[PDB]
Amino acid sequence: NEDHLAKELEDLNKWGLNIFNVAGYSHNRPLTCIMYAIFQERDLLKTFRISSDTFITYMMTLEDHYHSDVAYHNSLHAADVAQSTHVLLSTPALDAVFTDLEILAAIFAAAIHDVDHPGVSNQFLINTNSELALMYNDESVLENHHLAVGFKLLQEEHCDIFMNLTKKQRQTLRKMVIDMVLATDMSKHMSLLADLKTMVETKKVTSSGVLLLDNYTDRIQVLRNMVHCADLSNPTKSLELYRQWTDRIMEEFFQQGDKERERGMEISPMCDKHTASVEKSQVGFIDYIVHPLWETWADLVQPDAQDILDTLEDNRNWYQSMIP
Numbered sequence: 088n089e090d091h092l093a094k095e096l097e098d099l100n101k102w103g104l105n106i107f108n109v110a111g112y113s114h115n116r117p118l119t120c121i122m123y124a125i126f127q128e129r130d131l132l133k134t135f136r137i138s139s140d141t142f143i144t145y146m147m148t149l150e151d152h153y154h155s156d157v158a159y160h161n162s163l164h165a166a167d168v169a170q171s172t173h174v175l176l177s178t179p180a181l182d183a184v185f186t187d188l189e190i191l192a193a194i195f196a197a198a199i200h201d202v203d204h205p206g207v208s209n210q211f212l213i214n215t216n217s218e219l220a221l222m223y224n225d226e227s228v229l230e231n232h233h234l235a236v237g238f239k240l241l242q243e244e245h246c247d248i249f250m251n252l253t254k255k256q257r258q259t260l261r262k263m264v265i266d267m268v269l270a271t272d273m274s275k276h277m278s279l280l281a282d283l284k285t286m287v288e289t290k291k292v293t294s295s296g297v298l299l300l301d302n303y304t305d306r307i308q309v310l311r312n313m314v315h316c317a318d319l320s321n322p323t324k325s326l327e328l329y330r331q332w333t334d335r336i337m338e339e340f341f342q343q344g345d346k347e348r349e350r351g352m353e354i355s356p357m358c359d360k361h362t363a364s365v366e367k368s369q370v371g372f373i374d375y376i377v378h379p380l381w382e383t384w385a386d387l388v389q390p391d392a393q394d395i396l397d398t399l400e401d402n403r404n405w406y407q408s409m410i411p
């Protein structure tokens with residue numbers, strides 16, 4: 088088992104590490120397992136003076152706060168987004184661009200970004216007058232909640248993985264994590280993409296092909312988009328992995344649609360299992376959301392995302408060919 092897990096972790100720094108296999112070989116603790124691996128790999132425990140005890144205590148508690156009975160927004164998804172963010176941070180076009188604190192913040196944001204997800208959408212929470220929608224005035228309702236839970240868990244006994252950060256680093260990391268988790272709210276997608284396109288249109292690059300990100304606004308705009316890209320990365324993975332993600336999201340969608348139907352509500356797009364095409368839903372998702380984003384990211388970091396973008400396009404056309 089340990090040999091199988093070690094073999095899978097040979098792909099720790101690669102797009103398309105098989106996180107499903109990691110879950111299997113870690114007795115369904117993919118988030119704790121992959122986060123420990125990532126933090127060891129980047130020397131983050133040493134740099135930020137985090138004991139293994141504190142880190143594994145926090146991570147196990149965080150993972151326990153992902154719901155195992157939701158089909159998609161469980162800790163496997165979190166583990167995938169964290170590992171994908173870890174890969175994106177090391178894209179050669181971003182060499183030496185981000186600080187250690189920014190790296191830490193992004194990976195942490197990815198790990199916590201869907202914690203305590205109920206397996207329904209923001210629109211569902213708003214339209215059912217949820218306590219969470221009330222608390223956050225319908226504004227990034229889930230994403231605010233994920234932040235609330237992920238941060239509060241830091242206050243549990245032996246859980247404050249940021250204890251040895253400086254005061255300013257703690258404040259700045261909090262702000263950055265907030266920015267990156269809120270950037271996973273799909274209501275912010277068009278704004279984020281507009282800003283990414285602006286950065287591409289005005290990009291500055293060194294002689295070595297590395298992006299120049301002078302001011303803090305540009306830096307956080309790239310990091311926000313990076314975590315959003317990782318969140319939206321399933322269609323950019325090898326087809327055998329993408330198909331497993333699609334199976335999981337459609338299970339979660341159909342379950343929400345059943346709740347909507349039983350409440351006498353209008354069923355959300357793609358959530359009616361008696362009429363929904365899984366394949367049409369994926370092609371629309373890619374055409375309207377994922378491909379505009381990832382093509383723009385690819386342009387920002389060219390040529391480093393070329394195989395990722397080609398895989399996305401190939402998967403899109405494969406799904407389109409499977410439409411009934």
Ligand SMILES: CCC(C#N)(CC)Nc1nc(NC)nc(-n2cncn2)n1
Nearest residue numbers: 273318321322332333336357368369372
């Ligand atoms: C906020 C992220 C979210 C979005 N959008 C919803 C959880 N991610 C997501 N991931 C997949 N993976 C196959 N598919 C979809 N689909 C969205 N329409 C059809 N599919 N969405």
Ligand SMILES: [Mg+2]
Nearest residue numbers: 200201229271
């Ligand atoms: Mg989310």
Ligand SMILES: [Zn+2]
Nearest residue numbers: 168200201318
């Ligand atoms: Zn997510």
